[PDB]
């Protein structure tokens, strides 16, 4: 009957501690094409942010191409951002690229006394792969890049010019319902951080028992099982300061 995904994320490790809930909700669903909306919110790094997007995914037997557009709103700091994303996915392999475009201007900072803040423009490229012979095991590679004289990519107490970072992570999905992982990130100025995270994933089209059985993890990681996965993007609005 119903199709799509609800996902809770819990994360900790430093600056971006908190929780989130997101939904992927199809409005047109055929073998060749899916059109969907995605909506969610999060309380992370002492800010409340909500996000609304839509896109399409186009399917071939061996691959999927997709695009999406997002509006990101940090209600705590009143910062607004436009997002655009592309997708190229296959069995056991999900690649995405995302662009992050400021829609609001300088204004008095929410967290930093004596500063103005606004969204930092940037992009990221994201890969998630799963071992085909043991798909419960996944790896994550991200490159991200942001622009401005004083950007807070790692935290807002160490501001940096045009910072970039590479993330490498591993994660484990014993059953489709839950994924746990650890992400290591290294960036400019020799910044490093660690992110521990757990996701609870509910698939609307799956029975309860299917979602707590290890044998359905492989299905989830194939192209056709992954079709309702959330967009891979950063839903947090990275800020710059002046
Ligand atoms: C702020 C300016 C940026 C623009 C924001 C607009 C965001 C919308 C983005 C993507 C929406 C595209 C999805 C809409 C595409 C729907 C296609 C469809 O359902 O066709 C089915 C028929 O073929 C059945 O016969
Ligand atoms: C579905 C799409 C997946 C395909 C991935 C796309 C491949 C992208 C290839 C190369 C991206 C390299 C970006 C280039 C790296 C940018 C570095 C920069 O902007 O300057 C930093 C200085 O200004 C600091 O002061
Ligand atoms: C710390 C534990 C966090 C809670 C774990 C929750 C796991 C799922 C995560 C988000 C789910 C929220 C939305 C859950 C929505 C479920 C709707 C439902 O029950 O299906 C109707 C069908 O039975 C009709 O046939
Ligand atoms: C090979 C695979 C390796 C993976 C194995 C690594 C194990 C780490 C697992 C889970 C960490 C869970 C962290 C949960 C985060 C705590 C909740 C939180 O910090 O946020 C609450 C916040 O107050 C709300 O707004
Ligand atoms: C609509 C806005 C929804 C969520 C904003 C914050 C979402 C946090 C939802 C997580 C629910 C959860 O899993 O709570 C576990 C723990 O208590 C957490 O600290
Ligand atoms: C600036 C222009 C971009 C537009 C941005 C708006 C976001 C959604 C847009 C259009 C929905 C168009 C119609 C498609 C919506 C449902 C499609 C449909 O007709 O479904 C048929 C039915 O499901 C058969 O089983
Ligand atoms: C403006 C933003 C987007 C334009 C929306 C583009 C709508 C393009 C239609 C997609 C489509 O018709 O896909 C058919 C599918 O291949 C058969 O099920
Ligand atoms: C900047 C972009 C703003 C985003 C705005 C984009 C427009 C669509 C977005 C969300 C719709 C929410 C999803 C709609 C849920 C409808 C469910 C439905 O139609 O059920 C029929 C079935 O899903 C058919 O298979
Ligand atoms: C920029 C707009 C001004 C600000 C607006 C703030 C409020 C909008 C929040 C969320 C919209 C998306 C919610 C869509 C939820 C629809 C899900 C649904 O009803 O479809 C499932 C149903 O079971 C199928 O038959
Ligand atoms: C740009 C600002 C956007 C702000 C947006 C307001 C805050 C929305 C926050 C969280 C989710 C919103 C609730 C949407 C719930 C839809 C889920 C749904 O329709 O469920 C389908 C059903 O469960 C099938 O089994
Ligand atoms: C139909 C199949 C669709 C598949 C194809 C979808 C194509 C669009 C996808 C992603 C957009 C990525 C946007 C990346 C923009 C880079 C932003 C940037 O580089 O800003 C730096 C600026 O110059 C400061 O100096
Ligand atoms: C559809 C597939 C799309 C894939 C594309 C994703 C990767 C490229 C993204 C951004 C590159 C932008 C290049 C910007 C790097 C240099 C900007 C710069 O030099 O900064 C301004 C200057 O320093 C002032 O003095
Ligand atoms: C536990 C420490 C790390 C362990 C976890 C590391 C998992 C491996 C990650 C990426 C390699 C696998 C990526 C999969 C690449 C296959 C590309 C593909 O599309 O394969 C088609 C499929 O084999 C037929 O349909
Ligand atoms: Cl990701």
- Give how many domains the chain has, as a whole number: 1
- Quick one: DSSP state of residue 115? -
Query: Ligand 3, atom 5: nearest CA belongs to which residue?
Result: 200
Could you tell me which of 99, 101, 119 has the C-alpha nearest to residue 109?
119
- Tabulate helix, strand, coil % of the chain (nearest 5): 5, 60, 35
CATH code of 47's domain? 2.40.160.160
Q: Nearest ligand to the C-alpha of residue 9? A: 5
User: How many A from CA of 13 to the centre of ligand 4?
Assistant: 8
Q: Which domain holds residue 97?
A: 1-242
Contact in structure between 205 and 181 (CB atoms under 8 Å): no
User: How many A from CA of 143 to the centre of ligand 2?
Assistant: 8
Token pair for residue 127? 């890969």
Query: Ligand 5, atom 13: nearest CA belongs to which residue?
Result: 8
Contact in structure between 221 and 130 (CB atoms under 8 Å): yes
User: How many A from CA of 47 to the centre of ligand 12?
Assistant: 28
Query: Ligand 10, atom 5: nearest CA belongs to which residue?
Result: 50
- Quick one: DSSP state of residue 148? S
Residues 6+ apart with CB under 8 A from 4: 23, 24, 25, 26, 36, 203, 204, 205, 228
């Amino acid at each position: 009957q119903h199709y799509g995904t609800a996902e809770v994320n819990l994360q900790s490790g430093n600056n971006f501690d908190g929780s989130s809930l997101d939904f992927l909700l199809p409005f047109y669903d055929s073998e060749k094409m899916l059109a969907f909306g995605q909506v969610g919110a999060r309380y992370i790094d002492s800010r409340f942010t909500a996000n609304l997007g839509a896109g399409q995914r186009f399917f071939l037997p061996a691959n999927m191409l997709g695009y999406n557009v997002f509006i990101d709103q940090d209600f705590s700091g009143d910062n607004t951002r436009l997002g655009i994303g592309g997708e190229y996915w296959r069995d056991y392999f999900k690649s995405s690229v995302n662009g992050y475009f400021r829609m609001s201007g300088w204004h008095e900072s929410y967290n930093k006394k004596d500063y103005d803040e606004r969204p930092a423009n940037g992009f990221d490229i994201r890969f998630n792969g799963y071992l085909p012979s043991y798909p419960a095991l996944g790896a994550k590679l991200i490159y991200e890049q942001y622009y401005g004289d004083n950007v807070a990519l790692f935290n807002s107490d160490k501001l940096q010019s045009n910072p970039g970072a590479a993330t490498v992570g591993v994660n484990y999905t014993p059953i489709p319902l839950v994924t746990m992982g650890i992400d290591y990130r290294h960036g400019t100025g020799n910044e490093n951080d660690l992110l521990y995270s757990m996701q609870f994933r509910y698939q609307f089209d799956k029975s309860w028992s299917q979602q707590i059985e290890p044998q359905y993890v492989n299905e989830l990681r194939t192209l056709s099982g992954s079709r309702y996965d959330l967009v891979q993007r950063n839903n947090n609005i990275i800020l710059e300061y002046k």
